[PDB]
């Protein structure tokens, strides 16, 4: 433990202790096997540097050490030596153009007037009072900027290649000491080298022994560590991959360690090589595959998972179905499957391996986590720990599987069960009891700062809040600089938490300035800021989105409590921000969470009208999206039976209050009808009679008065189109959705025309006569804006032109009349081809313009098309 001590002096002394000859052996391999013993959990964050330092400083006394690395210089140039100044100064700091002698000292008198002498020391003392003041001011800069070089730096008119071996192994050690990723590379390389050159020295009998010794030692490493410093965990695995027979590292141990260390991929490769190599005789080897499954689930690549379990290797198909569900984020169905899985009484073909149960549990806990059923979360997180019904939470720190798999969810559960509303005091008891024992304390303080911070803040002890959250910021810095640069997905999962930390920091700092407490302006300031700062929508998982939503909720509750002697404004933010969370969840295909949040936030619909229309809009949007995924017959229930009813404007004159809604709601009703009609046409043979009563009863009312069989679909589409038209005429009132609404009407027309070309509907075509006219005159109208998605489908234009010839004139006279020619250059080729046949009257003016403006584009395709 001393090997890291704060004083540099004792650092050197203890290290020199441990490097003397009789303590660690003097040859290399005996050193490498020894350093495994020089480790403890607490020496971790430096252990890599320490090992490197030991190894190299034994290199230091080898005979080639002063022998220059390259025998000859590269010229005859004369070489000088110059020192570098380095006087606690940087570069942008100075403004530009400025003994029988000694016996003699006994010849002294002494001031006699103690008053005078007293004044003399008094002034002297104020002099040192100022001197100490300035030296304290300067010593901070001096601690920052003190730099010690490490080699000679001979100068010559050419490079001084002839550097002593020292001149490279010593700097390398310096860097290794000071930064840990270079430590990982150095230790990894050097360990690989030593264990590779061991061949030329010891027979296979010895090699088996030393390799087994390392394997034991490394398994100890991983299984005993608590800090989970990403570099060391990575280094140990990375060593293990590039040598055989280190590869049988305890699969569970590696899995847990990598899950925690946020450095998954190296672990994936470890277990990968394990699988392929140790089995080029137990066929299944479940204990490895399943933990690989755990890893790939971490890295979020549910795609590869689909491979592992469909191999008839041990695992049971219940897990397969669970995975298929949970890939589509249908986390509710996933939970149901898993819960039924873990509670199977008797199996066919053998009970699930010790490890499949583990994976099942972890997936259960996580699957709940993606959900808002956090009471269920806590119950799951606590049940397995002990025997009696009122759970002895203290047991969690007993044996490691819980410590790594059950804890984090336990603590996160209890935290929010607190921070939402109110609850008991289990967690305060738990954490307080925990925070006695040493390793006990270290786990919480190093990993879970962001949670202990909120816990303590609930108790209104702001000071401990500051300490913990500062620790969290430092911890993030340390465990982020550590993560190797290439692992983007890892670093991303890191950053997703800086928002949490900063939010906590801001609240603490906001309940610290009573000047910002008693007024009212800066509450508005903070509310406005949080209103428009959000996590990334399409990327950041909902397990952080809920973190920000709930944190902010609690913090507003506390601020409201402070400013009791407003609530309008706080409610406003709560509406808006939770609504944004629903919108997000809608994007991520995390539907069940969206269900729950809608249902939790409807009761706030009754209030003034903008939130009413917003809620109804969002719910219908979500219903549409849910329908898109699944359901073919019953899906009509998923929209029609409710969404039609809800969307009715009888509850809202807000269109008379604003126009944005007067676009949004209409497009919503449009798409509402659209899927209805699409699926009704899908397999009409078994819909109206299968949704036999109430939906059907609604259908004709939604359709036309005549209850005819086939014509009901057209009755739908007719009002559908007129409604989408209402949407567009809404759009023409001042890209937000207008490009999208335009494209939307486009798409309705497109599908309808495609369907029409496969049959003969005289009346539907007669009312269709508008459809192509609009598709051209309006889609191309939309092509003016960037409209990338539109610009792509421009061949659909020309084809529409051809097959439906009478209304070409609109094309020319309307929009090719106004196209920005480049927005056709993209595939100028096709129409310059089409430039012969009768419709060529179409591209005429466009090809002319692009010819003039950007001639060199047309030439190459045009020259060939000329021949035809």
């Amino acid at each position: 433990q001393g090997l890291i001590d704060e004083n540099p002096g004792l650092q050197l002394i203890i290290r020199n202790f441990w490097s003397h000859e009789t303590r660690l052996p003097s040859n290399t391999l005996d050193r490498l096997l020894a350093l495994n013993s020089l480790y403890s959990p607490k020496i971790e964050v430096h252990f890599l540097s320490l090992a490197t330092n030991f190894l190299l400083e034994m290199t230091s006394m080898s005979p080639d050490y002063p022998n220059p690395m390259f025998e000859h210089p590269l010229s005859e140039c004369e070489f000088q030596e110059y020192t570098i100044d380095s006087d606690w100064r940087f570069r942008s700091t100075v403004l530009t153009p400025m003994g029988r002698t000694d016996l003699l000292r006994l010849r002294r008198r002494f001031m006699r007037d103690q008053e005078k002498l007293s004044l003399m020391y008094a002034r002297k003392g104020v002099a040192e009072q100022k001197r100490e003041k300035e030296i304290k001011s300067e010593l901070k800069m001096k601690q920052d900027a003190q730099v010690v070089l490490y080699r000679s730096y001979r100068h010559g008119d050419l490079p001084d290649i002839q550097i002593k071996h020292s001149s490279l192994i010593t700097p390398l050690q310096a860097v290794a000491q000071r930064d840990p990723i270079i430590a990982k590379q150095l230790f990894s390389s050097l360990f690989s080298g030593i264990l590779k050159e061991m061949d030329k020295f010891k027979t296979l009998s010895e090699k088996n022994n030393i390799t087994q010794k390392l394997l034991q030692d490394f398994n100890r490493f991983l299984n005993t560590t608590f800090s989970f410093f990403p570099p060391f965990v990575s280094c140990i695995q990375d060593i293990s991959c590039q040598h055989a027979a280190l590869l049988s590292l305890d699969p569970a141990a590696v899995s847990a360690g990598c899950l925690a260390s946020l450095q998954q991929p190296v672990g994936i490769r470890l277990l990968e090589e394990a699988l392929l190599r140790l089995l080029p005789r137990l066929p299944p080897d479940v204990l490895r595959w399943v933990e690989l499954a755990k890893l790939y689930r971490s890295i979020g690549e549910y795609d590869v998972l689909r491979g592992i379990f469909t191999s008839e290797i041990g695992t049971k198909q219940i897990t397969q179905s669970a995975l298929l569900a949970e890939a589509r984020s249908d986390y509710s169905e996933a939970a149901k499957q898993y819960d039924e899985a873990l509670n199977k009484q008797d199996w066919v073909d053998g009970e699930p391996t010790e490890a499949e149960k583990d994976f099942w549990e972890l997936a259960s806990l996580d699957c709940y986590n993606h959900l808002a059923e956090w009471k269920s979360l806590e119950y799951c997180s606590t049940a397995s720990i002990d025997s009696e019904n009122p759970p002895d939470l203290n047991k969690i720190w007993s044996e490691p599987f819980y410590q790594e798999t059950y804890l984090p969810y336990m603590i996160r559960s209890k935290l929010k069960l607190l921070l939402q509303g109110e609850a008991d005091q289990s967690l305060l008891t738990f954490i307080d009891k925990a925070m006695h024992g040493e390793l006990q304390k270290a786990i919480l303080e190093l990993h879970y700062s962001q949670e202990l911070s909120l816990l303590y803040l609930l108790q209104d002890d702001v000071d401990r809040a500051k300490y913990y959250i500062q620790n969290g910021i430092q911890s993030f810095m340390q465990n982020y600089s550590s993560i190797d640069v290439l692992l983007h997905q890892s670093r991303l999962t890191k950053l997703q938490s800086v928002q949490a930390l900063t939010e906590i920091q801001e609240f603490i700092s906001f309940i610290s300035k009573q000047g910002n407490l008693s007024s009212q302006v800066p509450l508005k300031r903070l509310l406005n800021t949080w209103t428009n700062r959000y996590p990334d929508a399409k990327m950041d998982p909902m397990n952080i989105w809920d973190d920000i939503i709930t944190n902010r909720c609690f913090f507003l509750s506390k601020i409201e409590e402070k400013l009791t002697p407003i609530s309008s404004l706080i409610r406003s933010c709560k509406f808006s921000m939770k609504m944004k969370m629903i919108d997000s969840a809608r994007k991520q295909n995390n539907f069940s969470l969206a269900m729950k949040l809608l249902k939790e936030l409807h009761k706030e619909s009754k209030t003034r009208d903008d939130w009413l229309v917003s809620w109804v809009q969002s719910y219908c949007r979500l219903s549409h999206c849910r329908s898109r995924s699944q359901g073919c017959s019953e899906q009509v229930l998923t929209v029609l039976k409710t969404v039609s009813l809800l969307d009715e404007n009888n509850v809202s004159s807000y269109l008379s209050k604003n126009i944005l809604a007067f676009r949004d709601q209409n497009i919503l009703l449009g798409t509402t009808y659209r899927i209805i009609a699409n699926a009704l046409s899908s397999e009409p043979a078994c819909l109206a009679e299968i949704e036999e009563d109430k939906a059907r009863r609604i259908l004709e009312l939604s359709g036309s008065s005549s209850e005819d069989s086939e014509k009901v679909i057209a009755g739908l589409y007719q009002r559908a189109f007129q409604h989408l038209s209402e949407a567009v005429q809404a759009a023409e009132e001042e890209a937000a959705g207008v490009i999208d609404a335009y494209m939307t009407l486009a798409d309705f027309c497109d599908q309808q025309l495609r369907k029409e070309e496969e049959n003969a509907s005289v009346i539907d075509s007669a009312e269709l006569q508008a459809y192509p006219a609009l598709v051209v005159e309006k889609m191309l109208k939309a092509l003016k804006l960037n409209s990338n998605e539109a610009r792509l489908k421009f061949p659909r234009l020309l084809q529409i032109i051809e097959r439906y010839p009478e209304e070409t004139l609109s094309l020319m006279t309307k929009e090719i009349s106004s196209v920005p020619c480049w927005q056709f250059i993209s595939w100028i080729s096709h129409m310059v081809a089409l430039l012969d046949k009768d419709q060529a009257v179409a591209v005429q003016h466009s090809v002319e313009e692009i010819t003039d403006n950007y001639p060199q584009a047309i030439v190459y395709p045009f020259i060939i098309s000329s021949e035809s």
């Binding site: 939970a335 819960d339 119950y379 049940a383 397995s384 025997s387 044996e399 599987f401």
Partner: peptide, 12 residues
Amino acid sequence: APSRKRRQRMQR
């Protein structure tokens, strides 16, 4: 559906 569990013994 309610979420239920039971204890487990780790065989080590």
